[PDB]
Every structure is written in C-alpha cells, then in structure tokens.
Amino acid sequence: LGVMKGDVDRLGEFFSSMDSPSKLATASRFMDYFFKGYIGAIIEGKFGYIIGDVPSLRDWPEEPDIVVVYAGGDDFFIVGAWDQIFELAFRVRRAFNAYTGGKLTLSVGLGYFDERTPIYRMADVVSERLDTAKDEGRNRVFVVGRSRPLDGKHKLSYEWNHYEELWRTYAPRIYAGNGRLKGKLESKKGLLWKLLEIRELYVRDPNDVRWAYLTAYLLGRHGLSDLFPELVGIDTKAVERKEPQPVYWVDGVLKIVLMAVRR
C-alpha cells in the first residue's frame, strides 16, 4: 500500500510578501485552488503537454485507484496503489511547477506498507520520511527506504530533477513497461538482487573499492558490458567534488523495478 504526504516548502515566506489585503486574498485563493480543484484534474489524466514524461511503472489508467484522504491548501496526504502513488508524486510536482512560475517547490515522503498495518503507524512513518526530505533541501522527494552509511555525506532523499534524470537513463534500458523487463534480462533478476548486494559493499565501507570490479565481473560474465557502463569505473570527480558514487543512487531506480516485478 503506497502512501504519499506532501506540502509546499517555504510557504510562510510567500504569504509574508503580500503587502495589502487584496493581494493576500489573491495568493491564498490560487494556492488553495491547486490542492482543491486542480489536484483532481491531475489524477484525471489531463494536462499532458504540461506534465510530460514522468517515471511510470505501468501506463496511466482511465480510472486511477487513488483515495485522496486529505488535501488542505498546502498539505496533502494521498493513499492508493503503490505504483500510482509513485507516479502521481512526479505528476503533482510537475503541474505545481507550472501552475506557479517555477518559484515554489514541493517535498514528498513515500512509504510502501503492508495492508494490515495500523494507519497511525503509516502516518508516523511517512511524516518522518517527509521531514527527512524537508530538513535537507526542500525541493526533494523521499522515494524508498534505503541503507546509507552514517558518515553524514550520504542523504536518503532524491532531488526531483536528479531522480527524474536517473529514471530517463536507467529505466528505458532495463524496463519495458507494465511489470515486464526488457530483452536479455528476462529470468535474470539474480543479476539485479546481487547488484544490490554489491551496493551493500559500498554501504559497509565506501572507501573499499571492492564493489568496482565485482560489478565488472558480474556484468561481464552475463555479457552485459553495455548495461550500466558507469558502475564499473570509479568517478574520481565525485571524490573530488565530495559527492557519492553512482552505485549509491542506483538503488532508488532498481529497487522500484524489483518491487514492480513479482519478486
């Protein structure tokens, strides 16, 4: 069961900019109308020129299985199918990017839960996954729960344009649409689960370089030297810029596809 919980970021500074009561009464209706009327027409599949290409597991249904529990004026707590809660968070973000002039942001926590979980626990988890995305950059999404070292250099949440660019590179080569993989990777999930175990060696010690050639051997003996040509060679510029390796951010793209598959 997929749960998203989002709100507009640095909104109190926006309404403090209004200097007259007619100007406040305009900015507080237009922000109210996005989470009251126009969030319905996003779930209704409209506005395709404005939204565009978003990370979708399955293609967009005529009737989405989405139950909007709350949507207040900045805050929204929406539950639904975990494949369509995932896509809608990128579909709400892009429309809110263009309903404004690109000046106000969102932040979304995302959880994936058992059915038979108490709902006060699904709120208290996603409220923590929202606040983890909120004290980091306030234009960034929490996608999936993820392991990372406690060195303070790694952060669990993706920025919006970062994850949506990680999806346009890594998903059209391993994923075909509607819960199936591509050619030459059918019946090869054992590549992908062990690929996350090589990602766990980055988690246990990021200074150890043992993950670099184990990726090259495991992609090598399967003949898949074309897939993932940057998980084999270490990025020296990332060690220069003090940003994580590309083996670290591939978890949010693989683990969604491994959940999309029967697994």
Partner 1 sequence: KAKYLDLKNFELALRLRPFTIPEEIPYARVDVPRVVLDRVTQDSSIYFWEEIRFREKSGVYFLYSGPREVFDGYIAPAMRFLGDTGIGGKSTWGAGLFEVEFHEMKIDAPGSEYSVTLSNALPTKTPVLWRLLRKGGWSFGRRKPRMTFIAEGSIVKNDPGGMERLELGLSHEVYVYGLTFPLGVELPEG
Partner 2 sequence: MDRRFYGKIVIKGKIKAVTGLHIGSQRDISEIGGIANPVIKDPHTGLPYIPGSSLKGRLRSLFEILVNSRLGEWREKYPSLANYSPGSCRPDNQENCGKFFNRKINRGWIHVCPDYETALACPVCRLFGASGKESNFPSRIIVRDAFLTKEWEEKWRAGEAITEAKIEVGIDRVTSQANPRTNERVVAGAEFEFEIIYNVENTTHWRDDIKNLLTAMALLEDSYLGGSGSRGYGKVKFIFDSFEFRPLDYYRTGKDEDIVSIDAREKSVSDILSGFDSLFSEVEGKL
Partner 3 sequence: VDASRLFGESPDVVGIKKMLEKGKQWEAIQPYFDNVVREAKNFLEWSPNKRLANAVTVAAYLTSQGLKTNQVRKILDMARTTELKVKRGEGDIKDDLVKMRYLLAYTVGKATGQSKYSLDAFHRILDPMLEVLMGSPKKENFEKFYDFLQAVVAYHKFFGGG
- Cα separation, 227 vs 114, in Å, equals 33
Measured from the Cβ of residue 130, the count of other Cβ atoms closer than 10 Å reads 23
| Partners of residue 159 on adjacent β-strands | 140
Q: How far is the CB of 176 from partner 3 (least distance, A)?
A: 24
30 interacts with, out of partner 1, partner 2, partner 3, none, CB within 5 to 8 A per kind: none
Rounded Cα–Cα distance for residues 163 and 158 (Å): 6
Helices (H), 81-118: 82-99
Residues that bind partner 1 (CB under 8 A): 116-118, 121, 124, 131, 152
Query: Site for partner 3 (CB under 8 A): which residue of 11, 66, 191, 212?
Result: 212
Q: Which does 233 bind (CB under 5 to 8 A by kind): partner 1, partner 3, RNA, none?
A: partner 3
Query: 236 contacts which partner out of RNA, partner 1, partner 3, none, CB within 5 to 8 A by kind?
Result: partner 3
Distance CA 213, CA 211 (A): 6
Q: Using CB distances below 5 to 8 A depending on partner kind, what does residue 121 bind out of partner 1, partner 2, partner 3, none?
A: partner 1
- Identify which of residues 165 and 230 has a Cβ nearer to partner 3 in the complex: 230
Which one, 25 or 261, has the nearer CB to RNA?
A: 261
**Binding residues among 228-247 for partner 3 as defined by CB under 8 A:** 229-230, 232-236
Q: Which is nearer to partner 1, 10 or 58 (CB)?
A: 10
Strands 2-6 and 76-80: antiparallel
Find which of partner 1, partner 2, RNA, none residue 214 binds, CB within 5 to 8 Å per kind.
Answer: partner 2
Q: Where are the alpha helices (DSSP H) in the chain?
A: 11-16, 21-34, 40-43, 48-51, 82-99, 119-134, 160-174, 189-204, 210-221, 236-241, 246-249, 251-260
